[PDB]
Amino acid sequence: ESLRRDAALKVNVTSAEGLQSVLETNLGPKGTLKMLVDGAGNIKLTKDGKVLLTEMQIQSPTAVLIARAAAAQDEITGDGTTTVVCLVGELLRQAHRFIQEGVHPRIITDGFEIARKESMKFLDEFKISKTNLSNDREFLLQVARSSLLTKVDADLTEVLTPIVTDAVLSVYDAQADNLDLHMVEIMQMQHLSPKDTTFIKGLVLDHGGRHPDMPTRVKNAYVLILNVSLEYEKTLAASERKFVDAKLKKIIDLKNEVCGMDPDKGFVIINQKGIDPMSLDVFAKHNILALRRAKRRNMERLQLVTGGEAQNSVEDLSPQILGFSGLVYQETIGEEKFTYVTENTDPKSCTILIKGSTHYALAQTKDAVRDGLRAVANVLKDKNIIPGAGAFYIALSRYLRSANMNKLGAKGKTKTGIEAFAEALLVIPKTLVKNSGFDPLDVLAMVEDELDDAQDSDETRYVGVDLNIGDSCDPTIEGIWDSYRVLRNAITGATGIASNLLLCDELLRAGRS
Amino acid sequence: LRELDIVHPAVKVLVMATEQQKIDMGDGTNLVMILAGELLNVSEKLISMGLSAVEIIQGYNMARKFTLKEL
Amino acid sequence: TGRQAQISNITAAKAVADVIRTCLGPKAMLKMLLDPMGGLVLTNDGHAILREIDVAHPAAKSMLELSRTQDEEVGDGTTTVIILAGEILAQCAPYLIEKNIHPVIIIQALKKALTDALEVIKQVSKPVDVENDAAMKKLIQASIGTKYVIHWSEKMCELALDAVKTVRKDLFEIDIKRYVRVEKIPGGDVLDSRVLKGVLLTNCGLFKVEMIGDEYFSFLDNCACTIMLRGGSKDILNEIDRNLQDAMAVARNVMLSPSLSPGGGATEMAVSVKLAEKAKQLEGIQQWPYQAVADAMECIPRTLIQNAGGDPIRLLSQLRAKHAQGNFTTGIDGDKGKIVDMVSYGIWEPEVIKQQSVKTAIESACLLLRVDDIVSGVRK
Amino acid sequence: GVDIDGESDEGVKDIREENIYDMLATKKFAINVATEAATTVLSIDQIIMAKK
């Protein structure tokens, strides 16, 4: 009978092309947002790649591999993950143009690996060198603005642009040392609107004393780290009060050693367990702030923030234990009080105070800040900054069409594979124009007209894409820029994901349950 | 809307939006639901005309700053 | 039932109007139809489309008789006028079925709209003398641009303009042009024609009989004109009458209305921007349904933008600003969708083209509003 | 202003003697919540369900 075997056609494509049109709408700054609702009513609204795949449930088994392959995209980049998906979707339709004519799927895979080596040759000349040791905020505000406009609106962009710039600059130094593991400090709370968010240069504590006379706004204070607590317990009762009253005078004597009588020198204590409100009257007469119910993670961070030392027993007291703070403010919201400690001499970490009301409003700005801070973090690590606004994708397609048999010297079999890759390069700037309302083909046609004049101009220039006006522009004037490591793994990861889906000509179902 | 059980997750945006008004003020809740509900009703004509949400969102944000100047 | 029955009537004319949106202009598209019998009819003319289709909506049946009246006058380009009647019905959705506006109040607003429209028609009035044969030559060639007989019209349209002026003359100038007898001869070349002044059957010049497979030739000297047409093909005679016999409406419209209006859907551009200005001076309850008519006027030129593949939202921003500020003589190029004005576009249409278009549209729109509901099953 | 009891024919009434006024802080926050909620619905793309 023979025959049988199998045919490679759109049946295998329907699984991998389903996410194309789904992820095409949210691509770019003009894109939309996807929501995730549970049975309890909680709604998380964001377009970030975390919910697009891992938190998305679909009967298509291809999305499982797309979600697993996105683990490297979220860690290294995390922004614009839908661009790689649109690259694969265009190459799937190119199979019916090529593979359907009798071309073997292995033939077009050579064009992807050759393009990867040729992309690095073009990426080296296309990148622009910049000195990050000069602490220039010109490009830092542009890259941050380009990341915010692609996530939040223009109102949240103006506020968060200087905040994110100065957040990473605090840890950044002449040695280019930026550690995001030790500095996280994400405050999740509902207050005012997300446009009211503020920046803090130090750790914020989520606990506070309920005593009414506790000073809120204090010029400065000396943080005394204590892992124990001195209060009245059930315990005979005078035996435990003797150890508390004796160590209480040592706390007062510690304030006298630093000369606490000076209004320019304050004093503050913190304890892990609760504090007897009867003992708070002593701290109120001396204008001493008290803190109870402190977390173990927060107390360990105060040693590296305030600059003091962590002490267990109250019997041991030294001036080196007390820290320093330039500003101390305590705000009462709800049943908890938040103490703002900032303006330290040498802060080792900072935080961005989050505001909002609804659950989706906080989650929208929760990932946007961490992804926006990671985008500008690679700018300090990358000595070369890549022009954005589709300048890399459009100019790369022209480089492949110019040199084909002169440099690579294709025999004609791989010529279709190297050409199909250039067809998908214009899809990413094509989706940007479609979301802006302008015609995708007419706008890209005017951009290519300037590219032809740039080759005959005998000068170094880069042609950008402006979505508002719809004509060519300068990526330097526009401000859209990309880090070197962002497009390094993006082009490399795009060749691996697209090749793995094209090599599967047959699907079966079997295994162990 | 607090006591009511709504099975449509899309319209729940206006339900949770009341919390922003209750915390800031607590009054004019009926005025917000009528205003916010009408802005999405009059925008249905612009959607049928083929106008993208880019100028629609920018149009409301541009007129919002003009209203604060008149107040 | 009641307001719900009128909603089905609005969507009935809306579905028909959306089909003929692409039927206007030289870029006009085509529509394919499938009957239960299996026959297919592919044409760009909406005349045969409404006749072959049997609609289940009773409101759409009234548009069939309206198309016969519009085709009785001109017939070329007047089929899309039904869109204006459909846009008014869709314009009443925020009013009729929402604000509960009474239909007669809307009809009374249409009476003031039809009256103010004729004043705008007289504003774009551009009279021209009919004694010039070169001026009248380019006038009849306006409707020829939609056909391939353009370069063939050199020896064609000249025979129609000379025959009408003989049977027109004056009396006013009202006369009967139906005394002309046009004979069609199949086969031969389209360039071959017959110039004959007289009656085809005192001091007669000569008498002769030619050789024609159809009939012989006879001359009758009077103290009336006939046309002998020789087609370039067999069945081409059907399209020849559309470009000559049906083109006689242009010669009839220039005699009744010597004035000229912007052609190719460029007339209502200056009408929509002017109607919005006349609404601000009304200052009454009817102002809202009266001003909303201008929103229905701008939907007609969008058919050209849909044919030219442009964006009707962004393109009309600069186009409507030219008619409301610079001058009312500006127009829209239908071919490429460009801002080129009607001055260099070289095509102008009589005022009566839009007069009979708006008049029959308002009269057909009010009758549809006067219908409360529709019942069936009377078994007459 | 507009006060309708028996005056519906006239349509206008003095709000100074009636002391009918609107809160300014409410209107400032009304247009802020209405704009934020209207643009949020327009930004919705597709509903996502995770393991349910």
PDB file of N, CA and C in Angstrom, chain A residues 436-438, chain C residues 309 311 314:
ATOM      1  N   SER A 436      -0.713  51.951  16.257  1.00  0.00           N
ATOM      2  CA  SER A 436      -0.824  53.402  16.295  1.00  0.00           C
ATOM      3  C   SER A 436      -1.921  53.943  15.389  1.00  0.00           C
ATOM      4  N   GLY A 437      -2.551  53.094  14.579  1.00  0.00           N
ATOM      5  CA  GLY A 437      -3.602  53.502  13.678  1.00  0.00           C
ATOM      6  C   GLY A 437      -3.141  53.805  12.266  1.00  0.00           C
ATOM      7  N   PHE A 438      -1.857  54.092  12.075  1.00  0.00           N
ATOM      8  CA  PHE A 438      -1.336  54.351  10.742  1.00  0.00           C
ATOM      9  C   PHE A 438      -1.237  53.053   9.945  1.00  0.00           C
TER      10      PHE A 438
ATOM     11  N   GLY C 309      -8.579  53.378  -0.374  1.00  0.00           N
ATOM     12  CA  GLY C 309      -7.758  52.718   0.625  1.00  0.00           C
ATOM     13  C   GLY C 309      -7.098  53.645   1.620  1.00  0.00           C
ATOM     14  N   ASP C 311      -7.570  56.488   5.194  1.00  0.00           N
ATOM     15  CA  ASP C 311      -8.166  56.541   6.519  1.00  0.00           C
ATOM     16  C   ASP C 311      -9.190  57.664   6.546  1.00  0.00           C
ATOM     17  N   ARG C 314      -8.533  60.430   9.516  1.00  0.00           N
ATOM     18  CA  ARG C 314      -7.413  61.361   9.430  1.00  0.00           C
ATOM     19  C   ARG C 314      -7.439  62.194   8.154  1.00  0.00           C
TER      20      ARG C 314
END
